[PDB]
Tab-separated table of N, CA and C in Angstrom:
chain	number	residue	atom	x	y	z
A	22	UNK	N	4.025	-1.672	1.120
A	22	UNK	CA	4.543	-0.831	2.280
A	22	UNK	C	5.462	0.140	1.391
A	23	UNK	N	5.097	0.287	0.388
A	23	UNK	CA	6.159	1.290	-0.571
A	23	UNK	C	5.183	1.460	-1.947
A	24	UNK	N	4.297	2.255	-1.453
A	24	UNK	CA	3.280	3.105	-2.545
A	24	UNK	C	2.769	4.494	-1.720
A	25	UNK	N	1.260	3.529	-1.019
A	25	UNK	CA	0.276	4.791	-0.782
A	25	UNK	C	-0.449	4.195	0.622
A	26	UNK	N	0.085	3.275	1.192
A	26	UNK	CA	-0.568	3.286	2.062
A	26	UNK	C	-1.773	1.906	1.742
A	27	UNK	N	-2.440	1.461	0.738
A	27	UNK	CA	-3.488	0.814	0.398
A	27	UNK	C	-3.435	-0.580	0.413
A	28	UNK	N	-4.747	-0.887	1.176
A	28	UNK	CA	-4.694	-2.492	1.407
A	28	UNK	C	-5.473	-2.862	0.857
A	29	UNK	N	-4.478	-3.197	-0.686
A	29	UNK	CA	-5.502	-4.255	-1.647
A	29	UNK	C	-4.278	-5.033	-2.105
A	30	UNK	N	-3.323	-4.776	-2.376
A	30	UNK	CA	-2.253	-5.900	-2.536
A	30	UNK	C	-1.324	-6.162	-1.496
A	31	UNK	N	-1.426	-5.209	-0.279
A	31	UNK	CA	-0.181	-5.635	0.256
A	31	UNK	C	0.564	-3.895	0.156
A	32	UNK	N	0.229	-2.980	-0.333
A	32	UNK	CA	0.632	-1.903	-0.203
A	32	UNK	C	0.360	-0.932	1.108
A	33	UNK	N	0.105	-1.337	1.874
A	33	UNK	CA	-0.910	-1.058	3.279
A	33	UNK	C	0.684	-1.142	4.379
A	34	UNK	N	0.385	0.421	4.853
A	34	UNK	CA	1.823	0.759	5.863
A	34	UNK	C	2.635	0.780	5.039
């Protein structure tokens, strides 16, 4: 949740 809101590694939200 601390990058680009990407649902791959947990970057989502």
